[model samples]
Target: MAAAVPQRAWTVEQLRSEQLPKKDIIKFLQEHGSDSFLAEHKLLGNIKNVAKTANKDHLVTAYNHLFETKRFKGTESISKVSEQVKNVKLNEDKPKETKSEETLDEGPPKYTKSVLKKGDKTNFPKKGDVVHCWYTGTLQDGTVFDTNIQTSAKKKKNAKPLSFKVGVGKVIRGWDEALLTMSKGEKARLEIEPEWAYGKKGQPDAKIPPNAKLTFEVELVDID
Candidate 1:
């Protein structure tokens, strides 16, 4: 009996440096085939760096396409892997760093809301409540995105205090959920989860990139 041929292992550098290997993956995955080519994820991370240094959008697209069609078998986090692939376009806004350390504890709420100035316990906002507040939203690494704070907000001239119906779909899930815990004249800092904030699909226009966890300093001006 004839033995099966050994699969050829592929490296990120080899895939990156050579046009021959690049074209081969496109063609091979374009249709279908067995696992003749082996791709290791150690170099998988390097694929992100390759896209970074070269700014090759197609490289990330191509890699995802391979898994998209099942050329490779694994769970694919298109943005988690690409870093800036689909971001730079829609995937356009993630900065260079991947690891963002958090000083706060990871709690069961999947978020942490520290009350700077406590709101009313019994009379706090709840579902269907018309609420008004002022807010300054910041990234975890310490930078502002959306805010109505007087100092920075007025610079844009479109600055306005926040007004939303508590626990409604009008705002991000985090906002709706956390706003309920706050009452009139309350001021608190809310650190929300990624899914509750922006998730994998980000608000790039507001300078919020994909999978962003944000902090909001919110003050309830009134409850209407």
Candidate 2:
């Protein structure tokens, strides 16, 4: 009997180097292909046309092109990855539009007041001016605390109109600013914020509590 020839074991690189019909190449690879190459071919939909005219160099080039273009199975495009990162960063940069229930708390308190009466149009006091005025101070709940106006029966005994240099830190900041706007014989009410009154450390002796918002009925009786 004539000696039988042993079939050569084909490698992907060897197949790529040879010039053969696409079908022959596909058959060779299907029988002896690496798992990685087969997986890639399957992912590309196993097109027979790719193998028809392919040489070893052409097959290598095609595989590399697929991977570079992110068209290979289990791969993501560079643009897609970058877009995902950009979306995350955009969300991080955005400010929260709504507050959670637990995060809601009082911010800085609002300062507000209404004038009960407008004082004289002229003779307004300025900084460094000595002024005399009658004032009655009370809590928001109308609890009387201190006053220098003797006309009212609620006035403290021996109380008289008070005198002080204006805008010289001689009184609370609210009074310093409020008095400067008053004119002779003008009467107005002053609403003082906690920061403008006795703040966290209140005047214990005067019965003014900490962080108290005070109301005062003041008259610019005289200014010199």
Candidate 3:
């Protein structure tokens, strides 16, 4: 009987380094590189086509993949060691509040507010003034988060026009600022940035998410 030729096993490093013919390298990988080799290369998925075109480019890609896998593994090991030795406060890693004017206002700042109805300019609500208002609050996507307007039967039963003292932290910073600029019977649209409204810690009860930008059509119902 004729002797069968044994396929030569190829290491990933050898494949990366050796300048063998592309076809020869491909054949070697197909015959010898199985599950173990693929796992080592971090090419466990369908790497048949990639292996078939085992040129310098393909080999370089596999080498890069191996490097990244090892790098990630090293990072995980360090992280595990770090956790065991020190208490890491993940909340402390959260981004600091650094909102600026440009980020707060997206468009021509004046255009963000439009007067729906002008009220008594002389009777503008000041700090400590008791203000009563109806406001429909929404997200940029137009999802209404809150409103005191009794538009539905449920709202009639549960919600009423909001009443609060102006310029107190009684409401969100945005509402406080907006109310100060508003007069009795005046209606205006307020586009509030996250910093001004809920900021990062959104009103969970109100179904508002973190870092939410709000829009409100507020009507100054009455002011004391």
Candidate 4:
């Protein structure tokens, strides 16, 4: 009987860093495949570091791409995986009641209201500005789409708020408008129309459909 050939394993670093042509990588994948590649190496170690050090725009692009593709899998559960570990849940859930009862209790606002208060923080980027502020995003169905809060805490840093500049298009229109409306130490909750938020064509990561309305709570930090 003829001897069988053993499959060769390659690390992601080796895959990404080597000067080999894309075709070679594809060929390797065809032969060895994604599962085998994953089995041979940890998927995230190098990529995580790369992501952390990457440019903000690049990072955001990556984030949106992953989010849209549903590639970013959160391991955090609403309840703890083990008794010793602590877990947190989203407060986005609305009270469970009949539609009539819910309407009687607190109906949806006839018109959206601005929730801004004086002296809240804001994000400002003058090409080099690094602004920080807290933010949370939700969907039309009231599902929390994303948050930096828990992830920040898990990383052991207070979720430092984000800061960015106006007119840079670095942030979505809603954020730009909200920041523009902010003064130092001011807090505002802005109800942005789809055109001003994600726009008629919503972002993939945001998962906002066309003409979808959105909201954000912003605090103006400092213009550095």
Most TM-score-accurate candidate: 1
- What would the TM-score be for candidate 3 when compared with the true structure? 0.45
Encode model 1's per-residue lDDT on 168-203: one tens digit a residue: 687877777777788767767777767777777878
lDDT tens digits, residue span 1-224, model 4: 10111112222334445353333433333232233332232222344444344433333333323323323222222222223323685553333333343334566432243544565334334544555555545554434555532232333565466656566777765566556556666555555567666667877775667765564455555766
Residues 82-152, candidate 2, lDDT per residue (tens digit)?
Answer: 22235334455323233334533665333444454565778887788888877766665444577564532
In model 2, state the lDDT of residue 206.
74
lDDT of 2: 0.54
**CA displacement after TM-score superposition, residue 78 of candidate 4 (Å):** 27
lDDT of 3 by residue, 43-128 (tens): 34444565553456575454333322322111111112122223665454323343433545445432245565678777787788
TM-score of each: 0.47, 0.45, 0.45, 0.40
Residue pairs whose backbone atoms clash in candidate 3: none
When 2 and 4 are scored with TM-score, the better candidate is: 2
Q: lDDT for every model?
A: 0.54, 0.54, 0.55, 0.44
Candidate 2 to truth, TM: 0.45
User: Which one wins by TM-score: 3 or 4?
Assistant: 3
Model 4, TM vs. native: 0.40
Which regions of candidate 3 are displaced past 4 Å?
Answer: 1-112, 151-160
lDDT score, candidate 2, position 155: 28
